[PDB]
Write a protein that binds this DNA or RNA. Sequence first.
DNA 1: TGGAGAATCCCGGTGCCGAGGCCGCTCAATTGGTCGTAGACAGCTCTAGCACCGCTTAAACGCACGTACGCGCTGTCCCCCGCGTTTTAACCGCCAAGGGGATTACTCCCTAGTCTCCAGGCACGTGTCAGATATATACATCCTG
DNA 2: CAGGATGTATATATCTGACACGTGCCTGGAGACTAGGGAGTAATCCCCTTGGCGGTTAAAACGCGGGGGACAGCGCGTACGTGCGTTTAAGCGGTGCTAGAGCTGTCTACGACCAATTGAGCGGCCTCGGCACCGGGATTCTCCA
Lengths: 80, 81, 107, 108, 98, 98, 362, 362, 94, 95
Amino acid sequence: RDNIQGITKPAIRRLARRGGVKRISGLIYEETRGVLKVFLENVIRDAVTYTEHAKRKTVTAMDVVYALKRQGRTLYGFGG
Amino acid sequence: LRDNIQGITKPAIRRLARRGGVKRISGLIYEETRGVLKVFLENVIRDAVTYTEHAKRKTVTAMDVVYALKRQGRTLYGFGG
Amino acid sequence: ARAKAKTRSSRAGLQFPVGRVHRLLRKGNYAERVGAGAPVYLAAVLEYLTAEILELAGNAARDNKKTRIIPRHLQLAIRNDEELNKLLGKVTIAQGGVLPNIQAVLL
Amino acid sequence: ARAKAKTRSSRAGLQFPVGRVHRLLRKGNYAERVGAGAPVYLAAVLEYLTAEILELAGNAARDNKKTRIIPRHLQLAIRNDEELNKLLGKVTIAQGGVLPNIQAVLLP
Amino acid sequence: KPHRYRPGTVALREIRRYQKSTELLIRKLPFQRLVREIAQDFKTDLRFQSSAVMALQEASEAYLVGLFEDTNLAAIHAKRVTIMPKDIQLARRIRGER
Amino acid sequence: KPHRYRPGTVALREIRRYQKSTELLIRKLPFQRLVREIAQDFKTDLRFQSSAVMALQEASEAYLVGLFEDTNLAAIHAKRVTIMPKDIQLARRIRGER
Amino acid sequence: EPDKLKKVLDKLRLKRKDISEAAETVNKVVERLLRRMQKRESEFKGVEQLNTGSYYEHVKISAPNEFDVMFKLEVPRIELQEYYETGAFYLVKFKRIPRGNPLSHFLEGEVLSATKMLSKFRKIIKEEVKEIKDIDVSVEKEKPGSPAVTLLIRNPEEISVDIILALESKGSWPISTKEGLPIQGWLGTKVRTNLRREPFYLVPKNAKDGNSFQGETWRLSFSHTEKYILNNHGIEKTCCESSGAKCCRKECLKLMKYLLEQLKKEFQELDAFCSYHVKTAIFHMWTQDPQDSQWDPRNLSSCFDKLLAFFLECLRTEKLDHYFIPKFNLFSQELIDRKSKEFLSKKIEYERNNGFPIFDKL
Amino acid sequence: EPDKLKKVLDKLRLKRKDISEAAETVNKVVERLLRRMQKRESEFKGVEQLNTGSYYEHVKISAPNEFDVMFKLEVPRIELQEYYETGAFYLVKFKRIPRGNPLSHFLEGEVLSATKMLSKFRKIIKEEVKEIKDIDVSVEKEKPGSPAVTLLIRNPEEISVDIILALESKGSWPISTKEGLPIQGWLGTKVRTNLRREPFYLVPKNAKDGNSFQGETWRLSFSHTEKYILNNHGIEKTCCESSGAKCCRKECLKLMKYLLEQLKKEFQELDAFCSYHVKTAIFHMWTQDPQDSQWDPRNLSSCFDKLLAFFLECLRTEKLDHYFIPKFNLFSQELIDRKSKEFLSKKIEYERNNGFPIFDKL
Amino acid sequence: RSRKESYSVYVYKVLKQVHPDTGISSKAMGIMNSFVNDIFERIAGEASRLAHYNKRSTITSREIQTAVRLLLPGELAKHAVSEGTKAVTKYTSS
Amino acid sequence: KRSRKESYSVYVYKVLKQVHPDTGISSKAMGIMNSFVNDIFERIAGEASRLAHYNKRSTITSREIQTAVRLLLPGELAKHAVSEGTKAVTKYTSS
DNA sequence: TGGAGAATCCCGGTGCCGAGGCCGCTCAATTGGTCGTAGACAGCTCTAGCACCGCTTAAACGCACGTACGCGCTGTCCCCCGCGTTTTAACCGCCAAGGGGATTACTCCCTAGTCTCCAGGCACGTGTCAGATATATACATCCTG
DNA sequence: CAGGATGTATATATCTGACACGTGCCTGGAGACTAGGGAGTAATCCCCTTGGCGGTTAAAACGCGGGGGACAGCGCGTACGTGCGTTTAAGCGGTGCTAGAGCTGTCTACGACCAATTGAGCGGCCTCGGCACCGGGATTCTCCA
Ligand SMILES: [Zn+2]
Ligand SMILES: [Zn+2]
């Protein structure tokens, strides 16, 4: 139960290509894995706190919208 | 009253950058600094003018300035806050 | 004995609501009373901005040779203007894409 | 009747105004009804936080061998803690000073 | 020899198609595995709709590709072509995230 | 020869005293001259208290010295010792200010 | 009889052989001149020739002492302000333009001063004409009522050319053109969408003087669509070439066109009925024409009396709703008087009942 | 008579010459041991000896089979929770600690388990004692009521040493010490501020068992201040050395101290009146003593009957408000019974009226 | 029995006003709805802070226009000012 | 006229003496503290507003205060504030 | 290694002024009593999260080929820095004056609130069309020789 | 350079499922009125901001040397681009199910609101104590041997 190595290196390569990259150092994969991990930890912690005061057992999308908003990452297209 | 932009003395910039922790000071960066500093000032002072104007005052207080920093997300204390 | 409704949207000659808006205003816990021209002013500014957006939206979309509106067009158009991107910088857009761009040093 | 007027802060055993707080709350234009313990709750929160603040403030202050307080050591203590600094990230402070540090690369 | 392409060339056409495209490049399964993996720490035993998951994948992909362009320009100013960790660190630094 | 100091040395003691100090390094007169100079564009014929002016000098000095440390670290990652404009541009860039 | 139509057609062909040499010298020198325009610094840096072809069916032509070449110039974001509420002419204003449009000195406040730009354009073109004098060329100053810059050329004969500026606009495809151009059933909506995806023009021409702005009133222009629908007239679009069943549409087009040319040159009271009238007329005839069998040289006479019948039917009904603008019924008494139309019908009956006597000549 | 006081003083000096050799061997081996403590991995990495000097006026001493060495250990942010509302003992809890304090397993919930750390400390010290055996040393396990780790040393005689842990704290200078230590007029607030700028200690000692937490009740400790105020007793602070007018303060200190030592060793009912009593007593005497002329060997007998008078005056008033803690009136019947104090006064009268018979011996 | 309000009506109205020739994927619909709402929230909170500074009990369009000027980029603000002012003056004459 | 203004400097000094009565203070930092107090309260207040909106509630209780601070503050700090708040409210229920 | 001014810390007296204590007092808190209502249970109904179960298939990985990118190094060469001269001009304090914001009363107007009818959006359902899939053609490019 | 093979826009035809209309409904917005009190303005005052005149001294600008950090360039080695065949795990559809979010009733504590009275804190004066600050000895320092 790790799944962080489940983000396959050529997928990361494709993503970085979409980010406009010429050459790709082979060390950066675990680096970015950890950094994205930290990011997801922030987001998911906010959304879980939301969900808790929402007294819910399932999780919705609008809580996440508020999470992104409060992290200054305002996005639409997912209701609201 | 003209050419006050060159009132920004280079050694002031140098000492400022020293407090900013830099070591060698390229001779071109002063007018760059002046311009970037200037546009920052303009970004503040436009909203400050708008503030005092809606405040119907012929004068400028400090609270408007504070609110400018607020809306710009650069909130300051030490002047009432 | 009625005076059958002439909508305040029509009475300001606009599409955007005044009743629904004014409802949302009073039911927003902002102020107890709210002046009658404030929703008019609001609905006018917002309708103007709305149309301004939708203008460039249709522009981009027809340039792209498409039939309906997709996010890509919107992201492009927004970032192909200062004042929009100035006022809409940190917004994010799902399926919007990125502005294609490459520094000349990379060639 | 007409018993001695008593602060609700004594009934909470704290040093913050409860009447003033609940007033400004009701002058804050947020809601319609206000849960009786919520001003007390918030006030207790704020008391614990300002205690945390002024503690380390005076700590730093005596570490500068000083009696009264200046923005310098305050901003230092801010930029030394993890949780508070992260909370108070973009905050700017008049004459707060810079947190002194130099890169080892800049060093011989 | 006959059509063996030079480096970057293939990557140039790729970057062209990518900046033209908008869809995701992620198999959503290990991603949401990690979602529940991070989630269970704070509290386990919770369900969710897939909409929020797709929103997460979207926002995360968006944030990282923004970082990709920022670190790209950073290495550009650094006058190199291959990535490094220090630019990423300085990116987080300048935004105050570290 | 007898006590002619090497470069940076004097600057090191300076940086020590500076990061220890908190006061300003600006003659306030041309600064507020430029304040009214920028101000008059939008509208002239306006007065002000000096408190706000000092607040301006404070906030401006603060913002620029923050940029100084950021551009310093930028040149550090760039593995140099002298400043350049491109790091400053990239600083504004990463914050979306340009 | 189709043989007399072919002989006058061959007369037009011989005249076209004269126009080949004449207008080809003309086309080369204005190509040279327009090339000089792009290197000459101006707000008219990008101003290139709008080709409409070279045939009689491709350029609107008269007497050999006059010619016309269409010029295009792209324009940024443009709001369309109608003053002619019939739907034929609009005003000239911009949109927001955050960058800043470099024509404010030419902008009458918010309106666009067509006078000033036309003035300065005539200035720079006469400037360039006296700068290089390879071929014998000079600008002619005619009356300020028709904004067409005539350039007298002494090579080989005196050939004047009406220089007119058309503006390439990607602005709106206005609400006047919503229910315009109906080809949904007879031709197809697919093409129609693709067509309306393209740009369009507006010609600066001083209309009827019930207006504050003269010259600054501008009429709609879609000449690209017209040459498109010209080469795509029939139900099988591959016609006018060797691969389709050759109709008589261009034939009857030129017949009625130069019939009316000769008719106004012999009856000088009637001049307002310009070329666009028969163009919209044949468009509506086509949208009511379902069959190709009634467009062929065997049916040339039948279809031509049919065209006369259709046009005279439109005159008695007094309605000719424009193709692009069906709200704009161009059969308006304000611009074209009724008694003129009656004598026009009389001249049509003259041509009709007397075996077309103005085409026994050549 | 001051001569008999000087002869018993010289007896204490000869005993001090014995303690020099004995306690110097002791000081070197616990220095060695404490050195071994720092290389031994533990939560007690930084634990160094708190020196208080070596004199009889610098270490609290008894029978040669016992010794004491003070150890210091720094501590992070510590909240002070009073349970002893007289003001003499507190509880042991931390503050927020964002980094995370590495003693949670030792933290009884929020309280600090003095039992566990004392247990593990005795464990690691006996571990290290059996690891290296240069000098003959062993740990003695006495009754779990006095948390002083006695280390029996067979070099040269059986010298046990009470190892006790004192915690270096920069935490609060609590509200119990606000109106404590009054030296504002007689000595100075300047020094007082500088003194309160420094750290302080707390000794883990199981008080009166009216408490849930035994051993985890901790008494206040300021031994640095006590040795400071010892070397700075007089109004001219340069005294006890050669540069000032030599008083009898250390003299009368040791006189009353070892008078009470002999007195409890010959009257075994009275043992609770430990060393700190006369220390706070002489502090209050000093704060009511304005003159240095009444502290000199010429005035030695006068000042000593004066000290007896002051202490007996405090007994009849039954108040001895502590120097650091004036709210904490240590003359409380709950810890020191009244009839004991009465017989104590009787033994003082015994020593007083009979020319001090317990000091005609040596 | 769960009627909810939306603005797709007025969106489509203004849409067909400036361009009656266009379909849409409904993603963008909610995008602009949420968008304008968030904008108006900034405006409302802003004018609240202003009326607080002005110690007022209600809101008219003067404070609105000034907050707009305070918050909007360049000549767009002057445009929108013209729009709002002329439409309100128009509406008063009704 | 005179416009007697509100300031927390009284209560700041109160809590100050409640922890460090030995330490002197300036008034500039005092206003800094008052201002910052107001700012965080504004953050929390607008939050609690938007949250009670998300639950469509006409009332705000201590649970919401608790969740708001927890959503705003990191780690151990949040737990301690929860403890303090809960304790003093329950105390006040017993008066 | 010294050394030698150069900074840099540590004690003394003095203005000084300001942080903190005291008086008046006022308005906001407190108490009690009223009432409408918000949410708190309390069940009752659809849906969509998990979960599997085969099933395909392109993605990952592992491999090898090779080249070119940072890295280390050498000369070199303006360019910041350390120092002295003049200037210059920002503060330190004064007074004038006027203006402009803060305060009161009065009035007005406009929304809050009531009650009445009306249509607007929505939920749902259908008919059609936009572009994906698949295929195939024609051109854009790079790569070596 | 040129060809050639791959890569890609173009063009046709097909289907489907999204998107625009249709309709009934009834939920909240127009009509009309009244309260009544918040905002606009009228006079005043006071304080405070800008102007300005005269020293001073520290700071800034300008000349000047020097060495050093940047940089142009040069080998190198490896690791990351480029293909390829094998595994594999992502996604399709189905089935289902059940727990949990939404709905509705109702009643009940609870906060909103009005009166009297009070004391606390806030405006303003007294005051000593930190506390710069200049002077004067102590202690790193580093470029030189
Ligand atoms: Zn043909
Ligand atoms: Zn002595």
